[PDB]
Protein backbone atom coordinates (compact mmCIF):
# COMPACT_ATOMS: atom_id res chain seq x y z
CA UNK A 1 0.00 0.00 0.00
CA UNK A 2 2.83 2.41 0.80
CA UNK A 3 4.55 1.71 -2.53
CA UNK A 4 1.43 2.38 -4.60
CA UNK A 5 0.77 5.44 -2.43
CA UNK A 6 4.18 6.76 -3.46
CA UNK A 7 3.29 5.82 -7.04
CA UNK A 8 0.62 8.52 -6.94
CA UNK A 9 -2.56 6.43 -6.66
CA UNK A 10 -4.43 7.71 -3.61
CA UNK A 11 -7.07 4.97 -3.78
CA UNK A 12 -6.41 1.98 -6.01
CA UNK A 13 -9.10 -0.03 -7.77
CA UNK A 14 -8.75 -3.80 -7.88
CA UNK A 15 -10.53 -5.59 -10.71
CA UNK A 16 -10.24 -9.07 -12.16
CA UNK A 17 -11.91 -10.27 -15.34
CA UNK A 18 -14.99 -9.64 -13.16
CA UNK A 19 -15.57 -6.47 -11.17
CA UNK A 20 -17.23 -8.33 -8.28
CA UNK A 21 -13.70 -9.34 -7.26
CA UNK A 22 -12.93 -5.94 -5.81
CA UNK A 23 -9.80 -6.05 -3.71
CA UNK A 24 -9.44 -5.32 -0.01
CA UNK A 25 -6.77 -4.43 2.55
CA UNK A 26 -4.97 -6.70 5.00
CA UNK A 27 -2.01 -6.41 7.36
CA UNK A 28 0.44 -9.22 8.11
CA UNK A 29 3.80 -7.41 8.16
CA UNK A 30 2.80 -4.12 6.49
CA UNK A 31 -0.18 -2.42 4.88
CA UNK A 32 -1.15 -4.67 1.97
CA UNK A 33 -3.91 -4.44 -0.60
CA UNK A 34 -4.87 -7.84 -1.90
CA UNK A 35 -7.40 -9.87 -3.88
CA UNK A 36 -8.58 -13.43 -3.20
CA UNK A 37 -10.17 -15.79 -5.71
CA UNK A 38 -10.65 -19.58 -5.66
CA UNK A 39 -8.56 -22.04 -7.66
CA UNK A 40 -11.22 -23.13 -10.14
CA UNK A 41 -12.33 -22.45 -13.71
CA UNK A 42 -14.25 -19.20 -13.86
CA UNK A 43 -15.66 -18.38 -10.38
CA UNK A 44 -13.98 -15.01 -10.87
CA UNK A 45 -13.45 -15.67 -14.56
CA UNK A 46 -10.21 -17.61 -14.16
CA UNK A 47 -9.12 -19.61 -17.19
CA UNK A 48 -7.78 -23.13 -16.74
CA UNK A 49 -5.26 -24.27 -19.35
CA UNK A 50 -4.06 -27.79 -18.59
CA UNK A 51 -1.26 -29.54 -20.43
CA UNK A 52 -0.06 -33.10 -19.88
CA UNK A 53 2.15 -32.09 -16.94
CA UNK A 54 0.72 -29.03 -15.19
CA UNK A 55 -2.54 -27.15 -14.78
CA UNK A 56 -2.32 -23.38 -14.40
CA UNK A 57 -4.92 -20.81 -13.37
CA UNK A 58 -4.77 -17.64 -15.44
CA UNK A 59 -6.52 -14.37 -14.66
CA UNK A 60 -5.62 -10.72 -15.06
CA UNK A 61 -5.72 -7.95 -12.48
CA UNK A 62 -6.47 -4.31 -13.25
CA UNK A 63 -4.93 -1.31 -11.50
CA UNK A 64 -6.29 2.23 -11.49
CA UNK A 65 -6.65 5.14 -9.11
CA UNK A 66 -10.13 6.08 -10.38
CA UNK A 67 -13.26 4.31 -11.59
CA UNK A 68 -12.45 5.63 -15.08
CA UNK A 69 -9.00 5.50 -16.67
CA UNK A 70 -7.55 8.10 -19.03
CA UNK A 71 -3.90 7.06 -19.44
CA UNK A 72 -1.45 4.25 -18.69
CA UNK A 73 -3.76 1.26 -18.36
CA UNK A 74 -2.37 -1.46 -16.09
CA UNK A 75 -2.78 -5.18 -16.76
CA UNK A 76 -1.37 -7.64 -14.23
CA UNK A 77 -1.26 -10.83 -16.28
CA UNK A 78 -0.77 -13.32 -13.44
CA UNK A 79 -0.96 -17.10 -13.41
CA UNK A 80 0.31 -19.85 -11.11
CA UNK A 81 0.44 -23.53 -12.02
CA UNK A 82 0.31 -26.89 -10.24
CA UNK A 83 1.79 -30.26 -11.23
CA UNK A 84 -0.35 -33.35 -11.61
CA UNK A 85 2.01 -35.96 -10.11
CA UNK A 86 3.18 -36.19 -6.50
CA UNK A 87 4.48 -38.55 -3.83
CA UNK A 88 2.75 -39.19 -0.50
CA UNK A 89 3.26 -41.54 2.43
CA UNK A 90 1.76 -42.36 5.80
CA UNK A 91 3.55 -40.84 8.76
CA UNK A 92 2.80 -43.80 11.05
CA UNK A 93 5.21 -46.71 11.31
CA UNK A 94 3.76 -50.17 10.79
CA UNK A 95 5.09 -53.27 12.55
CA UNK A 96 3.62 -56.65 11.56
CA UNK A 97 3.53 -59.61 13.93
CA UNK A 98 3.70 -63.08 12.38
CA UNK A 99 4.05 -66.60 13.74
Amino acid sequence: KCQLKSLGFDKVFMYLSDSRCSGFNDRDNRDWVSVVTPARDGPCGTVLTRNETHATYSNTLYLADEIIIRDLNIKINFACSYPLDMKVSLKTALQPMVS
Binding site: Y15, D18, S19, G45, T60, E66, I68, I69, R70, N73
Partner: protein
Amino acid sequence: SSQGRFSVQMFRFAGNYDLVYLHCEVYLCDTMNEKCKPTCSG
Protein backbone atom coordinates in the same frame (compact mmCIF):
# COMPACT_ATOMS: atom_id res chain seq x y z
CA SER B 1 -32.87 26.90 -25.43
CA SER B 2 -34.45 23.83 -27.03
CA GLN B 3 -31.00 22.28 -27.58
CA GLY B 4 -28.43 21.18 -25.00
CA ARG B 5 -24.81 20.28 -25.68
CA PHE B 6 -21.63 19.51 -23.75
CA SER B 7 -18.10 18.23 -24.35
CA VAL B 8 -15.73 16.06 -22.32
CA GLN B 9 -12.41 14.25 -22.69
CA MET B 10 -12.69 10.58 -23.62
CA PHE B 11 -12.28 8.06 -20.80
CA ARG B 12 -12.45 4.30 -20.33
CA PHE B 13 -14.19 2.30 -17.62
CA ALA B 14 -11.28 0.88 -15.66
CA GLY B 15 -11.77 -2.86 -15.67
CA ASN B 16 -12.61 -5.62 -18.16
CA TYR B 17 -14.74 -3.18 -20.14
CA ASP B 18 -14.14 -1.99 -23.70
CA LEU B 19 -17.32 -0.10 -24.66
CA VAL B 20 -18.87 3.06 -23.26
CA TYR B 21 -22.50 4.19 -23.54
CA LEU B 22 -24.30 7.40 -22.67
CA HIS B 23 -27.72 7.96 -21.12
CA CYS B 24 -29.24 11.36 -20.39
CA GLU B 25 -32.56 12.13 -18.71
CA VAL B 26 -34.26 15.36 -19.77
CA TYR B 27 -36.74 17.64 -18.00
CA LEU B 28 -38.55 20.31 -20.00
CA CYS B 29 -39.45 23.61 -18.36
CA ASP B 30 -41.57 26.71 -18.86
CA THR B 31 -39.44 29.58 -20.13
CA MET B 32 -41.66 32.00 -18.20
CA ASN B 33 -43.37 30.19 -15.32
CA GLU B 34 -40.10 29.41 -13.52
CA LYS B 35 -36.37 30.06 -13.76
CA CYS B 36 -34.72 27.38 -15.89
CA LYS B 37 -31.07 28.44 -15.99
CA PRO B 38 -29.17 26.52 -13.29
CA THR B 39 -26.04 27.98 -11.68
CA CYS B 40 -23.69 26.07 -9.38
CA SER B 41 -20.42 26.85 -7.62
CA GLY B 42 -18.02 24.77 -5.56
